[PDB]
Amino acid sequence: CQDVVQDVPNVDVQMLELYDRMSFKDIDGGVWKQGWNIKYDPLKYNAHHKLKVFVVPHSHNDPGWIQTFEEYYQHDTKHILSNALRHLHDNPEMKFIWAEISYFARFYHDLGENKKLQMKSIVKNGQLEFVTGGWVMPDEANSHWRNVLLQLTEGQTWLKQFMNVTPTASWAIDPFGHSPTMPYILQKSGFKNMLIQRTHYSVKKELAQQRQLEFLWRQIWDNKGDTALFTHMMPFYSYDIPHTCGPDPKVCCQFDFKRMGLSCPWKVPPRTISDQNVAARSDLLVDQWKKKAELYRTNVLLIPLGDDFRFKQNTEWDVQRVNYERLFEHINSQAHFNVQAQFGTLQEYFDAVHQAERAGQAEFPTLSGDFFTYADRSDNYWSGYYTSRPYHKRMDRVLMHYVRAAEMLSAWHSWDGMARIEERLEQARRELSLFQHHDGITGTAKTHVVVDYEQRMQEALKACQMVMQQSVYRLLTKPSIYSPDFSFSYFTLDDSRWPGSGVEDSRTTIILGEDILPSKHVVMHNTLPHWREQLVDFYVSSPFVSVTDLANNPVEAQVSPVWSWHHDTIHPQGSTTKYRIIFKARVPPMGLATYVLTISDSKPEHTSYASNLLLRKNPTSLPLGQYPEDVKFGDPREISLRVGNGPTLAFSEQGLLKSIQLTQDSPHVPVHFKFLKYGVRSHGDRSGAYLFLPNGPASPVELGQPVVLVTKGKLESSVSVGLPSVVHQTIMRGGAPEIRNLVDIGSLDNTEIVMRLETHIDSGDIFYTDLNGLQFIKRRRLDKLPLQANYYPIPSGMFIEDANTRLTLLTGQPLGGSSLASGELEIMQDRRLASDDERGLGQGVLDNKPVLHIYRLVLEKVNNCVRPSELHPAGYLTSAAHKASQSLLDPLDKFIFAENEWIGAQGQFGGDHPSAREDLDVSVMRRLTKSSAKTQRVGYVLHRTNLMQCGTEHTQKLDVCHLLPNVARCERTTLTFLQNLEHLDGMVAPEVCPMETAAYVSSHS
Ligand SMILES: [Zn+2]
C-alpha cells in the first residue's frame, strides 16, 4: 500500500500550485472572448498528416430543471428518443450519444418488442452510444461519493441488464465545476476516458496555451498513478454548437442548422449547404476545426453537435444530418483540406486519440486537483448552489443513510417476492439517484420541480422504513415463531434529526402506564462494521422510566423535558405531557441491540434528571408536569458546562460558544461562534440559485436580548438560544460537541445567513474542505480573487490548523464555506434571493423552509500527529474527526415496537460480526439476487479512509466474503459489481489500502 502522507506526487499540473501562479486577468481575447486569436501553420496538414474530425451529435436532457422529470419526458425526451430510433435506423452513418439512463429506461420499457429489438441493433452496431450511463449526470460539488456510485450503478446495471453494454467513456458537460471524485469512481468502475466542460475561463485559457486540456487525471495523494484517468476538458464557454465548432461563435452558430424561433445572437444565420456555397462554407468551418485542433496534441478532433433537448423534431434530424453530409462530402473529396470528417461517437474519439498516443504522436501531461469554484465569466462564481435549497441538501444525506441501512438490513436474507423488498429498494435507489442530478441537490430547479424531488425523496424514505422494520423483525424474532405479515408495521422509526422537532413535531410518544402498557421494546441498528456506543433518545409519556437490556440488566439513563421554540420575540415552552429518555445503546458491527423502557411510580434507581436554567430577563415561570426538577430562572450571564471527561465549553450571555478546554489541565482556547449576513449588489450582477455575488464582507446580525435555555445532565447537557432566523444549540455528550441550527430565514429577502468560527489558530491563508465526503483538499485563500471565489463546497467537513492546533467542523448536509481570514471557518446556512442570476432558471430563491442543520466541532492538538509534507495538496482527518463525521452521516437507527407484546424477541444480532479497524467502512451491502436464483450473490463496497497518525486499537480482520454462510466463491469486482477483476482463490477478501475503495461479490449455495 502507498504511503499517502509523506510522498508528494509529481504531476505536470497541480491545480492549487497552478492557482497561486495564475493572474486570472479577464482580458477580452477577440472572437474567442476568454482566450486569444488562434494561429495554425497550414503546412501542418498534408496527405500523410490529415485532420480526423469526429462530429458527435448529442442532446442534453435535464431529469428536472424548468420542468419535472415526467413533464420534460412527455414534452421533449420521448420525442428525442423516438426520433433517435427512427432516424438512426434509416441512416446507418448517422450517430448519437446518450448520457441520462433515467430518461432512457422510462422510454425503453414503454416500447413494443419490435422497437426494443430495433433499439438493441442501433446500440449493437455502435450508432447509439451510451456515455457514462449513470441514472443522471450528477452534481460533483454537493453529491456524496456514495450517491455518485449509487446513481452510476443504477444506470449501468440497467444498461447491462437490458442493452448488454457497459460504457467506458464518461460525458459530464453540465455540472458546475468538476470533482476528482468522478475519475476516482469511474477508474474503479472500468472506465478508460472522461470528458468535462464546466471549468473556470482562466483555467481553460491557461491549459489551452500549454495544450494541457487532455490530461491523465490522478488523485492528489496518488504517487504511483494507478488512479489516473484520461480526461478531455473542452476549451470554450459552453457545450452548444456556437461554442463547440471552434473559437468564433459567430461562425460556429451558422453550422447549427436548427437556427434558420431560434436564431444567432451574432446576427448571421445558418444557410442551407448547396453546390453553390459548399466550398465557401467548408473553408469557414475547416478553418474553425483547425483552430480548435491547435489546442490539442493529436490530429484527432472532437466536435460535439448539440444542445439542451435537441433532436426532438424529425426535421431537426434531417436538417443537421443532410447539411453536414454535404459538408463532409465536399471536405473529404477535396485534398487541399487534408481533412477526413464524419459523424462519430465519444468512444470513437478516445480510441483514435489513444491510437495516435500508441503511435508516438503525443505524450499527455499528468494532473491532480479539482475544478472548483467555476466561473463562466468575469466575477460570476457559482458558489451559490453550494447552499441553495439547503432543506433538500440535508434530505439527501438523510435518505443516503436510509438506503444504505435498508439495503444492508434486508441483505442478510432472501425475501419471498410477496414482501416487495426488491421494488421498494429499486424505487428508493432511483429517487435518491435522480436527486444527484446537477439541478437536484444543487437547488437550481424551479419551485414545482424542487417539490417533485422532495415528494420523490419522501416516498423513498417511507419505502426504506418499511424494508428496515420488516428486516429488524425477522432478524430479532425467534425463527420457531417468525411468521411475518409483509404489509404490517412491526416497528415505527424514531429520528431526532430529520426533519427535527421544530421543523415538524411528529416523533411518536411511547405512552406507558402500569395498567395500559408498562414496558416497550426499542431496537438500535449500527450500519458501521464496528462496535458503537451512542446516546439514543425517545419521547415518553412519563419521566419515571428505567432502561434495561432484554436480560433485565439495568442501563443508566437521563430524562430531559421536551422543549419547543415560539414567536410573538422567541422563547421556549416545555411539554407537561412528554419527556426525553436518553441512554447509551451499545450496538454490534452491522448489528442490532434490543432495550426495554419500563414505567414506575417514582424516580427509578438508574435514571437521573436534568436541571433546566432559563437565562432570560423579566421572567414568568414554566410548569413541566410530573418532571421532578423545577425549571430555574435568572438573568443573562456567561456559563461553563462539562459532560463526562469530555471538553469544558464556555458560552457568552447570548448562548454562543466562547471557548473550549479540552483536558482538565489544558488552556481555555478561544472559539467564538457568530452569525452574519451577506446581501445582494444593488448595482450590476445579482446573486441567484447559482451565483454568489455579495455586496462586500458579511456584517453582524443583531441578537437583541435572546432567551438562552440551559439543560444540564449526567449524560447530555445543551445551550439553546432563540436568535432572529436561527435557534442555535450546542449539545454535549462527553466528546466533540454537536451544533444544531433550526434555520428559518423567513422573509429576509436578498439575505444569506452565515455561521462563522473565530479562533487564534495560525492558519494564515490555508484551509481544507472535503470533496464528496471522500477526500480533504488543501485550499489557499487568494486575495487576488473576489470573496465568492474563496467559497468552496462543504459536502462533509472543513478544517484550519497551525503547528499545534486544528479545528474541524463536520456537516450533516452539503453547504458553502470558506476560511476568509486566519483562524476563521464560515459556512452558509440559507439564502433568499428576490432576483434571477440570468442562467435560464428565470426565478430567484423565495421557497426557503425551516431546516435543522447538524454539525460536530472538534478542537484538537496535532503537534504530535504525523502531518503530510507542507507541499502535499491533501489533508486527512483524525480518528476523532472521522468518527464525528460518521455520527452525523450514519447514526444508530432507532425502532419502536408498534404492538403491546413481542413474542420471540431476541436482544442482539451480529454479536459474532468482526469489528473492523476504525478507518474501514462497509459503504454498501446489497443482495444482488432475488429468491428464484439457485446461487445467492451479495455485493459489498469497502472504503478505507486515511486518518492522521498521532500514536494510539485491538480489532479483527473483516472478510465480507464469509459474512454470510455457505460461500461457494467471491470475486473482486468493479464498484458497480458489474465486472469481476480477480477470482479470489481463498474466497477471502484481501485487505484494502488507505484511500482505496474495492468491491467484492460473495456467492452462496
Ligand atoms: Zn443540465
From Swiss-Prot:
InterPro entries in alphabetical order: AManII_C, Gal_mutarotase_sf_dom, Glyco_hydro/deAcase_b/a-brl, Glyco_hydro_38_C, Glyco_hydro_38_cen, Glyco_hydro_38_cen_sf, Glyco_hydro_38_N, Glyco_hydro_38_N_sf
Keywords attached to this entry: Disulfide bond, Glycosidase, Golgi apparatus, Hydrolase, Membrane, Metal-binding, Signal-anchor, Transmembrane, Transmembrane helix, Zinc
Statement: the UniProt record of this protein carries the keyword Transmembrane helix: yes
Example GO BP: N-glycan processing
A GO MF term: metal ion binding
GO cellular component entries: endoplasmic reticulum; Golgi membrane; Golgi stack
Enzyme class: hydrolase
Cofactor or coenzyme needed: Zn(2+)
Membrane topology designation: Single-pass type II membrane protein
Statement: the UniProt record of this protein carries the keyword Transmembrane: yes
Name of protein: Alpha-mannosidase 2
Upper lineage: Eukaryota, Metazoa, Ecdysozoa, Arthropoda, Hexapoda
